[PDB]
């Protein structure tokens, strides 16, 4: 009955005085952003463009003391416009070439608050990422290339990334299917990188691709072999028929 | 990275982290020794230079999960502003020596609105000011050299500050040997087989 007004005023009290500009515990210890990815599918993998296109649900967890509330026991889901009224990490994909957040009916964002101040922020993203390939052995090759996840502005003393759930942090990769390739293995890595502007956190997601040989047998090797065998017919055509032997 | 260099469109596609430094005394602050790394959305509330690229055919600033920008305020009022940009830039090419040519592409940087009386550009660090040239993965070309330029260029509306970054490209001849010259040499060689077929075989030698 009165819960509606109660929760409205709770949220207003949280946002009133809230500053977008400042990260949680600004000046204090760095904020730990835990991340999950649920792979929806991997679109075309292109040797000619040296890239691949990926679609995924991308989630981030962090705790912001400014958003703690006590009167409401619910994990409070809010309309996604709240994301423009909150601080959210500046994570970006360092090796992407072209990417966008989906907006089929509303922009595909998620904001879910919890009593202790933890924020769950979710996106659905399609991204085309650079993927360099060692074609020295094509078409009998296997390729490894990655998605590089990094914070654009904040250094390691302001934000820390970590895979939330360890090796279980990514799902769907065990189930996707591709015409040319099959996923042999995927690895989750976390580290930091150093620039003149400072040291920055990073997470890296890697896929190792084994090529399906059948299509190239159908395309390349069959006609080549069978043109080669066609030429050997000359050795059985009588060697007085110059026209046929040359033709 | 330089994603590709194309002769069919006389252009190249470039991706970079573009950084800018200036002093705005209005933003000087005291009582905080730290550098204020504020959320990038502050940039919409501050004055920032109107820098633009003269020869870009089109460009866009990456935007997923946030518009890729950085703001960092220092106590003395210095502002560090940077953003990740992908640009497709024009590069006229002299193809008169095509397989063995040596092209010279450039990126020209200028202030759109303010003249030399209002803004001056300089390379922060001199020749040290550009990095990442070591990680160009072009299959068709290789970076022989790069060097940086600074000058004032004058129009009817006034004299403007300009910086420009240049790349000297040398082509990898390997591809054209395999797919133009080996076929050409081989077909020329195969043509001389006609001189070994007996003269009476009109059908064979003509075919």
């Amino acid at each position, epitope marked *: 009955p009165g819960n509606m007004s109660f929760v409205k005023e709770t949220v207003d009290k949280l946002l009133k005085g809230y500053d977008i500009r400042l990260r949680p515990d600004f000046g204090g210890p760095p904020v730990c952003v835990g991340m999950n990815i649920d792979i929806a599918s991997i679109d075309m993998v292109s040797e000619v463009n040296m890239d691949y296109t990926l679609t995924m649900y991308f989630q981030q967890y962090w705790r912001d003391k400014r958003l703690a509330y006590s009167g409401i026991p619910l994990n409070l889901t809010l309309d996604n416009r709240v994301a423009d009224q909150l601080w959210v990490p500046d994570t970006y994909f360092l090796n992407d070439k072209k990417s966008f957040v989906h907006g089929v009916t509303v922009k595909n964002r998620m904001i879910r608050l919890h009593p202790d101040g933890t924020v769950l922020y979710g996106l659905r993203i399609t991204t085309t990422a650079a993927c360099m390939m060692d074609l020295r052995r094509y078409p009998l090759d296997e390729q490894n290339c990655t998605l*590089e996840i990094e914070s654009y502005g904040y250094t390691t003393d302001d934000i820390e990334f970590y895979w939330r759930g360890g090796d279980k942090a990514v799902t769907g990769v065990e189930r996707i299917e591709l015409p040319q390739f099959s996923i042999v293995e995927h690895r989750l890595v976390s580290r930091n990188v*150093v620039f003149a502007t400072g040291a920055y956190p990073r997470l*890296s997601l890697s896929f190792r691709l084994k090529r399906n040989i059948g299509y190239f047998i159908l395309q390349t090797y069959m006609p080549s072999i069978l043109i080669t065998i066609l030429s050997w017919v000359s050795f059985w055509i009588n060697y007085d028929a110059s026209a046929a032997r040359v033709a | 990275s330089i994603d590709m260099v194309s002769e069919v469109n006389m252009d190249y596609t470039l991706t970079m982290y573009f950084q800018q430094y200036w002093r705005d005394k209005r933003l000087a602050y005291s009582g905080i020794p730290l550098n204020l790394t504020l959320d990038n959305r502050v940039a919409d509330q501050l004055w920032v230079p109107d820098t633009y690229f003269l020869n870009d055919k089109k460009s866009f600033v990456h935007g997923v999960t946030v518009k890729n920008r950085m703001i960092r305020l220092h106590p003395d009022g210095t502002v560090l502003y940077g953003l990740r940009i992908t640009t497709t830039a024009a590069c006229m090419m002299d193809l008169r020596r095509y397989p063995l040519d040596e092209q010279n592409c450039t990126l020209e940087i200028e202030s759109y609105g303010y003249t030399t009386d209002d803004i001056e550009f300089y390379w922060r660090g001199g020749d040290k000011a550009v990095t990442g040239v070591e990680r160009i993965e072009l299959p068709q070309f290789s970076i022989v050299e790069h060097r940086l330029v600074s000058r004032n260029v004058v129009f009817a509306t006034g004299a403007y500050p300009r910086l420009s970054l240049s790349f000297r490209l040398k082509r990898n001849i390997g591809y054209f040997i395999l797919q133009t010259y080996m076929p050409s040499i081989l077909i020329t060689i195969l043509s001389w087989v006609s001189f070994w077929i007996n003269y009476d075989a009109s059908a064979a030698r003509v075919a």
Partner: nanobody
Amino acid sequence: GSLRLSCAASGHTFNYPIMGWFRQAPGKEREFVGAISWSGGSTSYADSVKDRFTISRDNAKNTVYLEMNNLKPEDTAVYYCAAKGRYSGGLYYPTNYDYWGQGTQVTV
């Protein structure tokens, strides 16, 4: 005097397109010296060794060569050869390099 060092590489080198040389004088932090890229051939140097040293590579033998001239004592140190990943950070910082050599000594 003048001298040459060599640094051969094996394994999945395609994922590590840049090779860098470092050095560590006794009782001091590690220093950047230079770097070179597979298939690129471009090179960069520490300002203290520019025009004093040079670096080159053989991409079929999978080895990198660093050449030295006008050698003097301040250059003495255990020199290292290391590999950098494709998407790791700047060159001058050894934290970005994942694989390292034996650390040959050089003296004068």
